[PDB]
Amino acid sequence: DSLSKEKLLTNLKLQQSLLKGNKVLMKVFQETVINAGLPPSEFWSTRIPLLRAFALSTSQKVGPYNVLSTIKPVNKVNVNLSREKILNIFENYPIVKKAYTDNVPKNFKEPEFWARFFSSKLFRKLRGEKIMQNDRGDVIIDRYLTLDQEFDRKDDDMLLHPVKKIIDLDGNIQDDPVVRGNRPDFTMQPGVDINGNSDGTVDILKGMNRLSEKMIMALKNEYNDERNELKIDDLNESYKTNYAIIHLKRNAHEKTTLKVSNQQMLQQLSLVMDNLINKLDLNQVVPNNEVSNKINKRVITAIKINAKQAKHNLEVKSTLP
């Protein structure tokens, strides 16, 4: 894809996009690629992550979500829309896009279309709302109602597919095809009206069902099994780590570019013991005034060097213009 070294080095449009915005990078490019003569290809060789990071920012999209449910009209009612939301409506509801592309540039402007769409029955049908015959709807959008019904049939086929026998409820009712018992009470069947026709509540239930199926199928875009699921994992052998161990043997050569005997050590150890037991004078520690000056001079010699270095150990003030 467009996230590799080869393609990013060749994507000149992207290379211009980030350089246009970035200032410090732009300054360097101007001095080194325009007047100095450095090839453009080599300049971007060492800045691959910068190019990739800039592309990923605009190359990612939000996930599918019910857009019309979040839309609350809030006599006049003001409903706030956004460009991102408008694109989302087109993606989640292809019928809305169909009515949009064929009318916006030909008959009426975009703002009129959205005002009509919200006041139409399609916006109530697309939403999981029971259509009321009392509602007037909108003339333009109401025509597409039949088209949406046809699209729903197409969507049902686009989603229909064989299901694993583990969760295949169709076969359970067909296990015995000759079951002739008592018909279930009206509580276990879809609601009906006086005339015996449907009330329309199952339609909205399927509508939300269809929306969820479409959203999940969108995730799995271009971008045996039952054996593992039916097994009890808790009864299996606990996971065992396969980490590696290292025994570090430490032995290295010594760094490269008068020994006394035990008798001498004992004599010196006796001498220090004899000096300590006899008497210890702390006053003799004072120097003789001939080495004290030398000692101070040596120490001050290092202080001056350290003080000079430590005095100058946001850019520092410069004397140049």
């Binding site: 211009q16 350089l19 246009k20 732009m26 490019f29 101007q30 325009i34 453009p40």
Partner: peptide, 21 residues
Amino acid sequence: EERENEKTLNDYYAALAKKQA
């Protein structure tokens, strides 16, 4: 002024497009 910095880049990139094309 930044406008010349972008214009010279745009001219250079336009020259780059003209040169490559």
